[PDB]
Homo-oligomer: A and B are copies of this chain.
Amino acid sequence: MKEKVVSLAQDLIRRPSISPNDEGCQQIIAERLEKLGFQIEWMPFNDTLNLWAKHGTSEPVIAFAGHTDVVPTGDENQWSSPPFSAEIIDGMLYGRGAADMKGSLAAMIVAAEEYVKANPNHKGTIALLITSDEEATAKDGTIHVVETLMARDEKITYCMVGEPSSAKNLGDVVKNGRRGSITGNLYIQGIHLAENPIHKAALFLQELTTYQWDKGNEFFPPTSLQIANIHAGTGSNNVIPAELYIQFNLRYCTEVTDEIIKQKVAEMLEKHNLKYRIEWNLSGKPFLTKPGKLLDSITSAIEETIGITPKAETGGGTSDGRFIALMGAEVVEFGPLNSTIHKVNECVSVEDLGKCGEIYHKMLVNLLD
């Protein structure tokens, strides 16, 4: 599997897919999958390309998720190997996206291809969910795919996000949780003395910024809140404003839900007698994948392939996992060393990419058979 993985990784690295421009990465991938009888669906939105490709006719649905976009290179003259050459030196594959995450994307694709080729009538559904914008504004990427699937009640049961998870040695870390994000765009209307609506708003703001959402848990720090924006008045003096806008964001853990958060904020506003409107913008749900089928399939795949037991951690780097978690899928993340991601001279071990393909493949085996 090494050479297949490496060859696909180089192919992708050679395509300079700075977000959100895919530069034909997904076209190469769809061409190899379609050839093997995967059903291909394109889900573009604005300037972002998204691919949803699947093989199978039943549950469980196992999605491999990743992105073809890469961050900018910076000064290409400060690279020892040109960033889109995909040079291999001393078993190290150099290039922007080598680690984050074209090498592990290639490994997930090759693993999926080999499993399907070997088992044309396999149980469940093996899917790839590939976006061209994880790294930038990312409003039109995985979130678009997930809203499309949800709109038509299509399910994903399990998801492996192939973001580079490993800290010091291949296999040493699997990510098994991420925080959610929700933004409140609050508009307080209508703005004797204690009845002033700016006073009632300030009463609200004081309760909001000292309310204890949770203490967190063993796996997450406590839910945090940011007041991102306060705006009343158009800039004219001696004119009382009609509206007071407050934008706040929570990065939240599994101790609370979007519904608890919405309800607490509604209660607080009612308690302080405020009239208002609010537009809520949910940017993903937290997840925490506990011991079970999904965590065990990837843990055992790593143990049996390279003889290391991963530690399960939450957070660190970024991923689209919280978007996928919006659908109720159970999510984990695994892939190669992340120390060089987003830096000059990004690289990845070619041997590790071969082992990653074996690992992804064995996870499919463990999760279906």
What residues make up the interface of A, taking CB atoms closer than 8 Å to B? 183, 191, 193-194, 196, 198-199, 202-203, 205-206, 209-212, 226-241, 244, 247, 249
Contacts and interface: CB of A to CB of B under 8 A. Distances in A.
Given A226-B240, A238-B228, A249-B237, A202 B209 contact: yes
B212 A198 contact: no
Contacts of A247: 233, 237
Contacts of A209: 193, 196, 198-199, 202
Contacts of A231: 230-233
A241 B227 contact: yes
A198 B208 CA distance: 10
A227 B232 contact: yes
A196 B211 CA distance: 11
Q: Which 3 A-B pairs have the closest CB atoms?
A: A229-B233, A199-B209, A202-B205
Contacts of A233: 227-231, 247
B199 A210 contact: yes
Nearest to A207: B202
A237 B241 contact: no
29 contacts: A183-B237, A191-B227, A193-B211, A196-B209, A198-B209, A199-B210, A202-B202, A202-B203, A202-B206, A202-B209, A205-B205, A206-B206, A226-B238, A226-B240, A227-B232, A228-B233, A228-B238, A228-B239, A229-B235, A229-B236, A229-B237, A230-B233, A230-B244, A231-B231, A231-B232, A231-B233, A237-B247, A237-B249, A238-B249
Nearest to A181: B238
Given A196-B209, A202-B202, A206-B203, A232 B235 contact: no
A333 to B, nearest CB: 20
Contacts of A228: 233, 236-241
Contacts of A227: 191, 198, 232-233, 240-241
- The residue in A193, A203, A230 that gathers the most chain B C-beta atoms within 10 A of its C-beta is A230
Contacts of A230: 198, 230-233, 241, 244
Contact of A198 (B194, B205, B235, B244): B205
A210 B183 contact: no
Contacts of A229: 232-237, 241
A71 to B, nearest CB: 16
Given A227-B241, A229-B234, 16 more contacts: A183-B238, A191-B227, A193-B209, A193-B211, A194-B210, A198-B227, A202-B206, A203-B206, A205-B205, A228-B237, A228-B238, A228-B240, A230-B231, A230-B232, A230-B233, A231-B233
